[PDB]
Design a protein around this ligand. Structure first.
Ligand SMILES: CCO/N=C/c1ccc(OCC[C@@H](C)CCN2CCN(c3ccnc(N)c3)C2=O)cc1
Ligand SMILES: CCO/N=C/c1ccc(OCC[C@@H](C)CCN2CCN(c3ccnc(N)c3)C2=O)cc1
Ligand code: NA
Ligand code: NA
Ligand code: NA
Ligand code: NA
Lengths: 242, 58, 297, 245, 99, 242, 58, 49, 49, 48
């Protein structure tokens, strides 16, 4: 026979090896493929679709789970009070886990790109108000007041016919990619904080509710990509699935 | 290679570059897929498309 | 638009880093040219000013009378790949039966090659390095005996669930890359890409990974760069019941496609810890050998 | 005509009549980050003249027994002038530096200092002497600020490496019979295009006497060593509130 | 309310610099994500037992018994693909026997 | 299948074998490489950089280690006295171990080329003097006097504005390459000796120090190359590195 | 071979001659590197270069 | 399982089965089983002459 | 992988087999060969003396 | 350390016996009237 020599790696089964294997059914032809709507080609396609961000991730009893999908605003005392805060880290435990972006993110070790959160006001038509939504890049501690938060990237939102506003969390990182951030040394990769403040006040006339909610929708910008495929942190099974 | 056309992707809108040593194409490697994307199909399936600068409801 | 002169004429924004030097092909050692006696005033090659920071520019030809020598000695074996693309030991994993360490038939090794001095001293000659690598896994019993045992190696990148047992659900390995191999088979071997979020790995990071007060209790984080932490390498015997044999897995690494920046002094004190350059203060030894007098061999 | 020199940048000018040329580290000049190396998307701020200028930060006294000192960059400047303010208000920073170490004496004094720049100068500890204790250097030792810090064991640069090989790094010597200063221009050195001026020290400046200072009784005994430095091509991004650490 | 996602971009919300992004989108293709072998079945052939003590076994081809793999495929409603199947066999201790 | 026949070498793992191994992460793309100053391409680049040669390798106590970096000269009695000596062998135990050339040399079995040692005088400006630095090729025993050393390759150094002088140790060998020299038969590869003598005298006026030091810097010439890659003689670890 | 460009040296100032059988280039051999050198970057990084014959400080 | 290692003049000769020298980071080593065929390699002309 | 089938002779070590074996020192270059008098090319040359 | 933050020159004694400090025109007005204590300090040039 022809002279060969076996090298290391021989006989091993590497789960990600892309090779050729003998076909079990020779001359077999599959059922033709008809047209089916909604074909997806790249997971990145799904990452640009906004899903609900559970900013209000506090209630935990079955009957109150739906309350996590929205947070409130109501008439205040004009002292630029804080409405809500959350970390911008998409692949970290917290609000982002509720989004499809966050979940897909779990199957990748590193990510890179700008994010966007669109806030939709669902109060009555007669309700008005101006909010200041801020993004604080790494290094900046949770803003103690509106004056401090205002020093970073922000948007001033005015309620009106357009029910929603978009806060872009631009990619501001020291590295080209960030790994998933968590407490400890990996906080090196944190994206930062997002805080919502009352710019003026939630105002309403006689006859309209004094409290209304805001729904947050999040997704990735078009410069977002992910690399280094990995298994998600969760395994949804306790014993054997029968 | 003059083989059979029995791959799951025969007649796809994305061409692949694969290796194979058998007469049946489904035995081939996964190769490389085409990098085309269409986010709009999911992120913007509106009938009357609205610009960025404008007010979405006018 | 621009109109004030200082703005039009400024260099603010020039991204073209001007370079005072350029590389030349040098496949062989330089040749020697014939030289003769020179008795000049003004010309003084032998005199230098080391204070400047440059090395002497004096050559054989100007210091003594030389003959012609056609030097064809190659410079090929001193390239980065020539020097580094030789597999060395960088990890050892024990899977004993009776034990204090990993008696449960599985083990998690943090990917850190600084636990072995030979390899470590070579890479620490440079500050930054970018490379791909070929990893080889040699397994046997502690006597070097080959036994009919099946093993599973799995790479767990940061964020993926680390197995906590020989029967962990994580071994389903649906996305992580795993290798299944027998100790009876040759050593398993795979290629690993350059995976850092940075443009290069760096063997030295003079800083901290996070913001805040850097009090005493957190000083173990000085020098910790997550850009160098690629994950965990997990190994287990494939079964629901304990293995019949005690095992050892030696890990070899062969870098390839290497690039390196910023050379530095080479370690001259024994290494103590993986994470830092700490040296034993009561045993500071000279870099090399000593003698009794400066006037005697 | 190589012994004389003038360094002018910003609203500051330095003169010297006993120089030994100028060293441009790793053979390249400081430059701004290009659009393809960059990754962060916000438009940076480049203050120019208000931050790229010479700052004289500190003076040490050279004595017959001095062991040597080191400073960390950009740490030495994080609390000085307009440069410091930008470093505090921004997450991202990048720049180069022109370092001018000054030390003059008389034609009857002698001694030689080695002035060098060592990127990623990680400091180590003596490990409890016996080497069995995994102790770590405190914040004031890794980032000493403008006052710098004195080497405990110069022979191994407090990091288990031979100072005898430090010359593989951009350097100059201040040999009293020859020159009274060292000038080194350093480009931005890192594996990333920008980084935190607070959490990361790109390189350290080492000033170590290799040939001890000496002079006869009667000659001026106070021989200062002063450190002046200028940032070059400073760029900052990722604006928010000021943070000191 | 329209049902579309925001069309706002970095360029219109803050002052941006130019960035030439060459980060690849290659690892997020369907094959990149799915063409990684995972466990989908386990068959026991014990000697002394309650299950298959007779030296044979029949496994209905259904890959939904393992959560890792299942959660990935259930991200989509319809899927068409070829597949490479690998069978790893040993004793319950992971020992290799001449069988 | 296609007829093959396994040859010896099969299954072996040779640590220096340059082969192909299956890739663990298919379709993975690394973080792009930005520009970084100081890229080195060949170790020979580093061998041409002068590092301090510990000619005075005698003190050994921690507090006196720095004294090895320099040696002294001082007023003598005009009898062409000996100032210092050392072997020129770069890969041998002795002064060269302090240099980066010497250390890199340790990773190679054979070397070839000319060497150079630049001596820098650090006395006061008012100090003058002339030294004779000699290189004695193989076979010549340590010169008993200046008259004997003078018969070999040498340089006569005159102190002045130029603080330094360079002694070139030209390549004078019988073989094209030399292996590392040591006591015993391998002395066959010794390079020779270097000795420093007082040509006139260290002279100084009233008011200046009577003793000054000289620092020696060494590196290789441009015709220097190395071959046969090997492990260094040292292993800097005692027990396991934790 | 029409593979991916995922080697650590893709876009280097030194070209390599390698062998590979996989779609990912980092799986390739180390091959041969280019023999270019630049000692001056380290041995002579002076702004105003001084000749051999001359006196370094004039 | 055996290990063969070539130690050129000047490299540290192992002094025990557990010598640090077996890390073989630069010396060329061959790992092989007695069960495998005979190990085999090519050696160049290495003399200084 | 590509379909192969091992034939007899596999694993044997024939002392006169002229094959290829992996090189232990990559990128190594031997000392050049200078001129040396008296090179012999064929034993038959010696048989005529 | 404080003085160093403004316009300055670092003078090195040597063969050139002298050095020149330029006090550049840095004023809010095109011309300054003579400065003195009081409101006319508005026109002061500064300190050396
Ligand atoms: C079945 C799957 O098989 N998978 C095998 C496999 C093998 C290797 C692997 O990743 C190898 C990572 C190495 C190439 C580089 C290690 N590095 C970078 C720099 N660094 C540093 C830097 C500074 N301080 C310390 N202490 C350490 C360090 O240790 C992943 C997976
Ligand atoms: C010697 C011969 O070696 N022969 C090997 C061999 C291997 C595999 C094989 O067929 C593999 C079939 C899988 C590719 C797809 C399995 N599928 C399709 C969707 N599906 C679903 C859908 C909805 N609910 C549930 N529960 C399950 C599911 O489980 C046939 C033969
Ligand atoms: Na196969
Ligand atoms: Na940092
Ligand atoms: Na292989
Ligand atoms: Na062979």
């Amino acid at each position: 026979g022809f002279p060969t020599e076996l090298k290391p790696g021989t006989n091993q089964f590497l789960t990600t090896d892309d090779g050729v294997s003998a076909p079990i059914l020779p001359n077999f032809h599959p059922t033709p493929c008809i047209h089916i709507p909604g074909e997806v080609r790249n997971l990145l396609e799904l990452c640009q679709v906004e899903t609900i961000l559970e900013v209000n991730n506090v209630p935990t009893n079955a009957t109150s789970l739906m309350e996590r999908l929205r947070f409130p605003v109501s008439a205040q005392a004009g002292k630029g009070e804080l409405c809500a805060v959350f970390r911008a880290d998409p692949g970290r435990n917290g609000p982002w886990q509720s989004t499809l972006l966050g979940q897909l993110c779990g199957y990748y070790t590193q990510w890179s790109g700008s994010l966007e959160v669109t806030f939709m006001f669902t109060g009555s038509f007669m309700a008005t108000g101006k909010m200041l939504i801020a993004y604080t890049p790494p290094g900046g501690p949770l803003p103690k007041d509106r004056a401090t938060a205002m020093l970073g990237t922000h948007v001033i939102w005015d309620f009106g016919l357009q029910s929603s506003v978009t806060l872009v969390i631009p990619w501001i990182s020291n590295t080209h990619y960030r790994a998933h951030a968590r407490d400890g040394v990996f906080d090196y990769y944190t994206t930062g904080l997002v805080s919502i403040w009352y710019q003026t006040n939630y105002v309403v006339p006689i006859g309209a509710p004094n409290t209304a909610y805001i729904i947050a929708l999040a997704a990735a910008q078009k410069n977002f990509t992910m690399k280094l495929c990995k298994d998600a942190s969760d395994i949804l099974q306790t014993g054997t699935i029968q | 290679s003059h083989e059979n056309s029995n791959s799951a992707t025969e007649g796809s809108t994305i061409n692949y570059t694969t290796i194979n040593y058998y007469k049946d194409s489904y035995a081939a490697t996964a190769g490389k897929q085409s990098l085309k994307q269409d986010p709009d199909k999911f992120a913007n399936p509106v009938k009357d498309i609205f610009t960025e600068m404008a007010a979405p409801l006018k | 638009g621009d109109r004030v002169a200082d703005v039009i004429e400024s260099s603010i924004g020039d991204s073209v880093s001007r370079a005072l030097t350029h590389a030349l092909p040098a496949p062989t050692g330089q040749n020697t040219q014939v030289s003769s006696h020179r008795l000049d005033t003004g010309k003084v090659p032998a005199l230098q000013a080391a204070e400047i920071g440059a090395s002497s520019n004096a050559s054989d030809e100007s210091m003594i009378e030389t003959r012609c020598v056609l030097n064809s000695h190659s410079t090929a074996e001193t390239t980065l790949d020539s020097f580094f693309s030789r597999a060395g030991l960088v990890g050892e994993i024990d899977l004993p039966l009776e034990g204090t360490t990993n008696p449960n038939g599985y083990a998690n090794w943090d990917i850190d090659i600084t636990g072995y001095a030979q390899m470590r001293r070579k890479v620490e000659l440079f500050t930054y390095m970018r490379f791909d690598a070929e990893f080889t896994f040699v397994a046997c019993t502690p006597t070097g005996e080959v036994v009919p045992q099946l093993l599973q190696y799995m790479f767990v990148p940061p964020g993926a669930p680390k197995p906590d047992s020989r029967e962990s659900l994580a071994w389903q390995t649906a996305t992580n890359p795993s290798v299944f191999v027998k100790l009876s088979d040759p050593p398993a071997q795979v290629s690993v890409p350059f995976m850092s979020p940075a443009s290069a790995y760096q063997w030295f990071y003079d800083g901290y990974p996070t913001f805040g007060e850097h009090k005493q209790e957190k000083d173990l984080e000085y020098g910790a760069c997550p850009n160098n932490m690629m994950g965990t390498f997990s190994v287990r015997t494939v079964g629901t019941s304990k293995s019949k044999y005690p095992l050892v897995v030696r890990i070899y690494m062969r870098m390839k496609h290497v690039r390196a920046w910023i050379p530095r002094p080479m370690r001259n004190q024994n290494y103590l810890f993986k994470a830092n350059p700490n040296y034993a203060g009561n045993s500071i030894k000279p870099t090399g050998a000593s003698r009794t007098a400066i006037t005697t061999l | 005509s190589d012994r004389v020199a003038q360094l002018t940048i910003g609203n500051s000018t330095i003169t010297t009549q006993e120089a030994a040329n100028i060293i441009v580290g790793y053979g390249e000049w400081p430059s701004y980050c290009s659009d393809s190396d960059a990754t962060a998307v916000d438009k940076p701020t480049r203050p120019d003249v208000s931050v790229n200028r010479f700052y004289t930060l500190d003076t040490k006294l050279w004595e017959k027994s001095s062991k040597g000192w080191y400073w960390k960059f950009p740490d030495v400047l994080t609390e000085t002038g307009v440069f410091g303010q930008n470093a505090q208000f921004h997450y991202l920073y990048r720049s180069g530096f022109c370092i001018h170490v000054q030390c003059n004496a008389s034609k009857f004094h002698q001694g030689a200092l080695l002035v060098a720049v060592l990127p990623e100068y990680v400091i180590g500890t003596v490990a409890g002497g016996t080497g069995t204790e995994d102790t770590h250097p405190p914040y004031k030792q890794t980032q000493p600020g403008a006052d710098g810090f004195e080497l405990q064991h110069p022979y191994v640069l407090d990091a288990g490496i031979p100072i005898s090989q430090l010359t593989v790094c951009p350097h100059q010597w201040i040999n009293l019979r020859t020159n009274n200063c060292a000038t080194i221009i350093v480009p931005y050195i890192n594996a990333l295009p920008f980084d935190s001026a607070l959490n990361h020290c790109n390189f350290g400046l080492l000033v170590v006497p290799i040939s001890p200072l000496d002079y006869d009784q009667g000659a001026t005994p106070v021989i200062p060593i002063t450190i002046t430095l200028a940032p070059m091509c400073s760029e900052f991004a990722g604006l928010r509130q000021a943070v000191t650490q």
